[PDB]
Amino acid sequence: PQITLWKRPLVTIRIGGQLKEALLNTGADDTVLEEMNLPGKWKPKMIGGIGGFIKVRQYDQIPVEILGHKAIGTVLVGPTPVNIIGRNLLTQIGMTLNFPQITLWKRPLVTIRIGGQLKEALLNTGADDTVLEEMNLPGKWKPKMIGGIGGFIKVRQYDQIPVEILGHKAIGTVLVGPTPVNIIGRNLLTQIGMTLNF
């Protein structure tokens, strides 16, 4: 079965006996759910995202059912804006990225060509938009705010920017600002024909 990326890849999961909606997120190493009660011992941890770091409760070896597939692994609970299923559980359910096939054991990092430079970027199904580390691109831009796990960052929005990803041509909006990682979001993933599959 094959999930396209024109919309957010939201799915129903079952966890601690309850149903929830969560985002299938190739850009997350770990699974992070909104504040909730889970049984058992937990340890405090910190994780980072596009807007900085947050404190979470780490629960180990928690059963989670996703698209009718059973995973058992680490679930973090804290002030995430969206429930996200990260690579720790996506691998357990046999999910891959396809366009060639890309497995999710490690961060799905690939080379992109943009504005005459070659960069390494993260194929991120949990990003609406593409966000590149600071660079002085020519052209008209407008300011924008974009959010994620620890809050918001200010970025520059450039439109109709030609990109090439894994030999595939795309052209779209690129946001530029102080992101810790270059991110390829769904706006461009849909253009190069990328899907999630399991």
């Binding site: 995202g49 974009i146 994620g148």
Partner: peptide
Amino acid sequence: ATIMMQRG
């Protein structure tokens, strides 16, 4: 405008 990158 939601960018859910997460690193552990």
